[model samples]
Target chain A: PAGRMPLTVHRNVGRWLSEILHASIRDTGVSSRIEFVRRTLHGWVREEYSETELPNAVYRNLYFPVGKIETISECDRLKNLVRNVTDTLVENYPQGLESEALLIALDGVKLELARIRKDIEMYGDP
Target chain B: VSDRPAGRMPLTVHRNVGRWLSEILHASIRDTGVSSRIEFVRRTLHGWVREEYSETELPNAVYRNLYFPGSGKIETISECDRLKNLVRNVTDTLVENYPQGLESEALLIALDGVKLELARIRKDIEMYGDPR
Candidate 1:
């Protein structure tokens, strides 16, 4: 079974998460790194790569162990990154570029990250 | 042309506040049985804060629901005041409609967070000047 995010979800979720990173994070360089990752994924999606291919590449690039837990760990890191950024947004409010789009983006990425963890949990492992 | 309106309430913030209230209000509806008043409140507030309706263009039902108080202000107040009033009114309306603890606690917590953020945004605007 092809257990993965549909194209629409993947495309929009990636955009949302990246925008969240950009919107909420104050450190320009740090946020741009996430945006770069997003753009890279967007590029792959644009090229219509298979679902597993990008995750596998991420694992390979990051020196993650070739296992489901590795991906889950990575997802946790991303989730926490979003959480920290949003926490800052909460703490900083309008100063942190806090807006409806930011909140919705946070929600989108939170669900998307959870979805990623589940996908890797059910499949994508040895 | 104008250097940011005094007490500028950015449309983004208005929409954000509306969304936050809508999520909590909608969840309360889901957890409990439907109430037309709750539904009406949610829909009306959602559109109202989101600026979906012009001042002169609200539905008759909305006018009947919110305007009856004669205490409501137009949508042109400073962001802080606007958010404060929205939070106050929305909380009061929901508290009346929802059962105790049904989603009351969560709604309260969410409103507290809104106020906290509202204060921060208020201070931010005061210090840094409104960009909207």
Candidate 2:
């Protein structure tokens, strides 16, 4: 039951995040921007984290089943990748209030990624 | 029908123009701050045109299949109807709202032409049987 519960929760969370991000992208005319970020994250996932050990919570969270981030290193790599990209884009554009708003959205994503990374790290340590 | 000609005549001259019309319609919709809606409309237009154009022998290899045909021709009667309706909706929206810029007005005229030609082709199909 615990196994099934985590899978269900993971799916529900993923679906909610997908819907929310899709709506935000449409509203902000930022679909292209986010697509670029996703591509960059994928490249990071492939290059640095393919063979690394994974966290137990990542397994519990169904990252392997989702076929997205399979290892703990991938989780950390993705967090750093997202943070770096957000920093670069925000620093380059700095569209005043609009940039601030965009950063807020990116920060939400960053928080989620960081949480996953922490879970992975804690699971590996023990 | 045997003595008509060795080569096939162009089945749908208005088809490419229809595609151009669809692009213009997409641009107009995007201008309305409904870019996602415009993408939706464009996808519909692409599907509709592909369905209509694949039923006849158009001498081009692209229009051979109905669902995923590579040709850009408009082939089906139903597709023609959908395209006409889409063009009308786009034109009516622009005319009613008084869209700015010469590009917008030019697109409106092109859409009107596409609609008229589509009607003519449909009437011809009804009267003369398969025109291919």
Candidate 3:
């Protein structure tokens, strides 16, 4: 209980978050990829807050569910893929946010790749 | 509240944006199924936003809804429709683009700014009451 910390954030995580926010926002190279990364971090801002400092009322009112993006099958699969990369990044990270060297783990790319594979397996080249 | 050339927009606009900002601003929580509408709307209309919008040249009518909706209040239904139509136009562009996503930080800033403006008008309708 004393030493435990959330996989998503750890000691000095605040600093890393600030840095990540600036970098992801400023980056011009890959636009959507940045958003995907940014969105993950954005989700954390709400999520981690509820557990630590935010009041229940504020959190509930603000964080509205994104709901289904478009149709049925296509969106859900991508949703899961996005969630998994975000999930895996938060869950498996042993390093704290700042010192980890890489904010998003290399495995995140792998997870996304896996999702792409699944899509190809079911759908066709698009 | 949102109907005039320089007037108030609908209460729904305030409710939506306030709700969205409320979530984004607080660091203590995520998606709570609770209430933070009052605080959210207050901050939206309070200040900073105006300065930023001025720098960007976006329409003030974009944020035409609020609890203390000061001066610009939409007078006619057609005025309201025009204001809403303005917002939907931007959303349509972003949606049609799809999957490709924010092409540049400039686009991101531009789009996100619009999103924020749209949210403000849509957030606080229940208490504020629709003008129609």
Candidate 4:
């Protein structure tokens, strides 16, 4: 499902992430926005998955949607958003935020962004 | 905390998200003639970008979807009753599962089910428009 970047990572991760990132994006400017997106995300994921079940325990509700991105223009906007977020987290980890889960989340966002960019170019929408 | 699957503080965000969704849906109904509770709610969302989810819009984004007149149309009394039942079912589920909190896996899954039902009804209404 395409709720948010974290939604691509894990179901347990998406709900909280949508809240955090959405608020952060709204509250801050573009410069700090990327920072808030990744660091806080890794921060939350690390905290939530601390439990025994963690990423595994979180059920995957692929059906959970955050909003709408039906138009080609909307797809363009989201593609860039995910691209920036993934790049921000690409070289990050260890010093920034270390977690195997975080890595997957970033990779997932990275791939999804790429796919949408290509799909929109080819099919006119994602 | 126990009421929600994810507990408090963190789940507070989801409750906030849920509240936003409620406001958007209600507002869409008023702004757009698409009065079907489920239609307006689903209309708040667009098709998926890539996978099983959509990129949720802010509250007033609904104004765009409601641009057209008769955005939601029920062709028959039977269909209206059926969709109304589906909406009621969803409302009841939301009440029963998360009267206390909305962070539970069960509640989220149930929401997906309701979303699907509403989507179906919305599709039907779009495919078969009502002649006013």
For this target, which candidate reaches the highest lDDT against the unseen true structure? Answer: 1
For every candidate, give the share of true A-B contacts it also has: 0.00, 0.00, 0.00, 0.00
Q: For residues B1-132, could you state the per-residue lDDT of candidate 4 as single tens digits?
A: 111222222223333434444443443344222233223223222211112222353233542332221333444445445544544554554455333421232233223333433444565566676745
TM-score of chain A for the candidates in order shown: 0.42, 0.40, 0.26, 0.34
- Residue by residue across B1-132, what tens digits does model 3's lDDT show? 121122232334444544443433242122121112223323424333354244344455554443233123433344334544543543344344323321212222333333333333334343265755
In order of DockQ, best first, we have 3, 1, 4, 2
Which of the predicted structures, 2 or 3, would earn the higher DockQ when compared with the native?
A: 3
Off by over 4 Å in 2: A1-66, A123-126, B1-132
Q: Report the candidate with higher DockQ, 3 versus 4.
A: 3
Output the worst ten-in-a-row residue range by lDDT, candidate 1 chain B.
B1-10
lDDT of 1 by residue, B1-132 (tens): 111112222344434445645543433333221122234334434433324345565555544444222222112226457546756766765555445531233333334444444554465567577556
Among all candidates shown, the one with the greatest DockQ: 3
lDDT per residue for candidate 2 within B1-132, as digits (tens), equals 121112221225334434544553433332221222233333433333443344454334554332122133344576567656766666665454433433233333334334444554566567665755
DockQ list for all candidates: 0.02, 0.01, 0.05, 0.02
User: Which one wins by lDDT: 1 or 4?
Assistant: 1
TM-scores, chain B, all models: 0.40, 0.39, 0.25, 0.32
Best by TM-score: 1
lDDT at residue A66 of model 4 (Cα atoms): 22
DockQ of 2: 0.01
